[PDB]
From Swiss-Prot:
It catalyses: Thiol-dependent hydrolysis of ester, thioester, amide, peptide and isopeptide bonds formed by the C-terminal Gly of ubiquitin (a 76-residue protein attached to proteins as an intracellular targeting signal). Changing T31A: In strain: Mu/B.1.621. It is found in: Host endoplasmic reticulum membrane. This is Papain-like protease nsp3. The gene is rep. Responsible for the cleavages located at the N-terminus of the replicase polyprotein. Participates together with nsp4 in the assembly of virally-induced cytoplasmic double-membrane vesicles necessary for viral replication. Antagonizes innate immune induction of type I interferon by blocking the phosphorylation, dimerization and subsequent nuclear translocation of host IRF3. Also prevents host NF-kappa-B signaling. In addition, PL-PRO possesses a deubiquitinating/deISGylating activity and processes both 'Lys-48'- and 'Lys-63'-linked polyubiquitin chains from cellular substrates. Inhibited in vitro by GRL-0617. Residues 1-167 form the Macro domain.
Length: 167
């Protein structure tokens, strides 16, 4: 039993809700919140911009030190950093950004990072401003993640479309 509330159960391990991931993380304080990151951990917009803003830019400060030490992530890769005031940890995961011409096949690799964590609050990878089809991203999430994932979707029309189209 966990403290995630109001989710629709899609499969044995995947749950979905129309919600703002920032407001969800503040309420639940999950062990892990997933950020929709880029390789440079530059948290400018989308989920990344919103999560970083909620940390008062502490996420960005920590991320800049991470990059200065380690260099960029790989597309499909991840790193674990602090969750600041939002969660215990933030798993920064880089899905392919179709608006950069990146290979959508790497979306499965991106979701594989979730399997290293027993429970996660997460967005749909490569959705929103990353330019991928969210229906496909959900398909890949369900077919790749085996640990317990709570997917937040703030856009209602999208959420309703995702539920109503789910196979
Ligand atoms: O897949 C990630 C989606 C993409 C998206 C953006 C705009 C839309 O209208 C529909 C989808 N972004 C988010 N998902 C959950 N919480 C969020 N908080 C801030 C952004 C954000
Ligand atoms: Cl977005």
């Amino acid at each position: 039993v966990n403290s995630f509330s109001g989710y629709l159960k899609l499969t044995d391990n995947v749950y979905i809700k129309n919600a703002d991931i920032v407001e969800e993380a503040k309420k639940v304080k999950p062990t892990v919140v997933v950020n929709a990151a880029n390789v440079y951990l530059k948290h400018g917009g989308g989920v990344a911009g919103a999560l970083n803003k909620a940390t008062n830019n502490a996420m960005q400060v920590e991320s800049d030190d991470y990059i200065a030490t380690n260099g960029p992530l790989k597309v499909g890769g991840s790193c674990v950093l602090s969750g600041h005031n939002l969660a215990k940890h933030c798993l920064h995961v880089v899905g392919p950004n179709v608006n950069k011409g990146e290979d959508i096949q790497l979306l499965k690799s991106a979701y594989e990072n979730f399997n290293q964590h027993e429970v996660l609050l997460a967005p749909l990878l490569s959705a929103g401003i990353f330019g991928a089809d969210p229906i496909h991203s959900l398909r890949v999430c369900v077919d790749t993640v085996r640990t317990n994932v709570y997917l937040a979707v703030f856009d209602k029309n999208l959420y309703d479309k995702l539920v109503s189209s789910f196979l």
